[PDB]
Chain A
Amino acid sequence: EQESVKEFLAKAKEEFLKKWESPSQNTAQLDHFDRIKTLGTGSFGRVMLVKHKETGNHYAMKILDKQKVVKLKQIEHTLNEKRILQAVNFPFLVKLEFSFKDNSNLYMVMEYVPGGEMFSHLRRIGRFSEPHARFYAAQIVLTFEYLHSLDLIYRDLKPENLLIDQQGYIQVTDFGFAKRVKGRTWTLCGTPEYLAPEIILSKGYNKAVDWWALGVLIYEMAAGYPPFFADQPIQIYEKIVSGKVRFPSHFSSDLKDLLRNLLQVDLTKRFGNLKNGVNDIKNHKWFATTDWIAIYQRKVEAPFIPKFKGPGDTSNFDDYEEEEIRVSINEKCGKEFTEF
């Protein structure tokens, strides 16, 4: 069982490194697709539902405005995300199908996940039962075991970044802030509620920050709100570093003990960062009923299946004003994005 995980991760690393060293490029073009709907909008891009003309398949298409990417200093993060997405392979990571660029934009075409974000379902239902939360948590544990074995720190875990697919399983999608680093790194980044204290305190930090963020996610899924909140981020940071946290009275004793070890300010003591590594988490009493292989194989019956009315249904996404997708007559920012 243990040697099986070792052998799996070794093969996974060999495959990842081959694709990392020789990324794919320019595997489709814009007029292969019809636009259906804007699913999301950000400061330098949008995510669209599109239909592939030849096949009729639906996909999500992330469209990034190269000039806005440069303006907002996102060149390296954008190239990094695409390089990671074309190299990884894991059941809970969204699949990149095509990428290409034109005079104005960068395009990443991914499997469409019609269930939408965990965030929306969590806010709607209020909170998840502990079995429901544990089902999702197990998928994140396995995903971080995979990513960390590739020396990738994820750094932006939150319900907003987790999609729910038609079988009720999670898909991670966005990797701009991920970093392939084996030792320490120093960048201040992430989302305030999910920041580990060592990031806030300007320390050199490591993959343990992802296990802290798992603790925040488990707490938020099971309570309906995160462990540390306040009006403004500066105020959230003081609570995080304090190393004080309260639990709803309905939290089980096992859940509280797990969260005390994940939400551990002393990264010399935090679960996931000790000699037994991820196994301190997998073998914890809260996960006693978890069949780790069956989760990986997606054989476990999901506790929740999103409403699904067709291959291009968008009902689980917010509505946005549809804006033009302009492609300039002039090539923009060619040198910056030559590797894309």
Chain B
Amino acid sequence: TTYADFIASGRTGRRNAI
């Protein structure tokens, strides 16, 4: 699913600025 793809991205935690 798109959700499963999101979990797989590894970017589900807090995101830092560039």
Contacts and interface: CB of A to CB of B under 8 A. Distances in A.
Interface string B1-18: 011011001111011111
B17 A230 contact: no
Contacts of B15: 158, 160, 191-193
B3 to A, nearest CB: 7
B6 to A, nearest CB: 4
A248 B1 CA distance: 10
A27 B12 CA distance: 39
User: Chain B: interface secondary structure?
Assistant: loop
A246 B2 contact: yes
A156 interface: yes
Interface in A221-240: 224-225, 229-231, 233
B5 to A, nearest CB: 8
B17 A229 contact: no
Contact of A230 (B3, B9, B12, B16): B9
8 contacts: A156-B17, A158-B15, A189-B17, A225-B3, A230-B9, A231-B9, A231-B11, A246-B2
A123 interface: yes
Given A191-B18, A225-B3, A229-B11, 11 more contacts: A177-B17, A189-B18, A191-B15, A191-B17, A224-B6, A225-B6, A229-B6, A229-B9, A231-B9, A231-B10, A231-B11
A160 B17 CA distance: 11
B12 A123 contact: yes
Interface residues of A, number: 21
Contacts, number: 38
Nearest to B5: A229
A190 interface: yes
A119 interface: yes
A160 B14 contact: yes
A81 B3 CA distance: 36
A330 B1 CA distance: 57
B11 to A, nearest CB: 6
B2 A191 contact: no
A259 to B, nearest CB: 15
Q: Top 8 closest A-B pairs, CB basis?
A: A225-B6, A229-B9, A191-B15, A191-B17, A160-B14, A231-B9, A229-B6, A189-B18
A190 B3 CA distance: 24
Nearest to A189: B18
A119 B13 CA distance: 9
Contact of A191 (B6, B9, B10, B16): B16
A209 to B, nearest CB: 13
A327 interface: no
Interface in A128-182: 156, 158, 160, 177
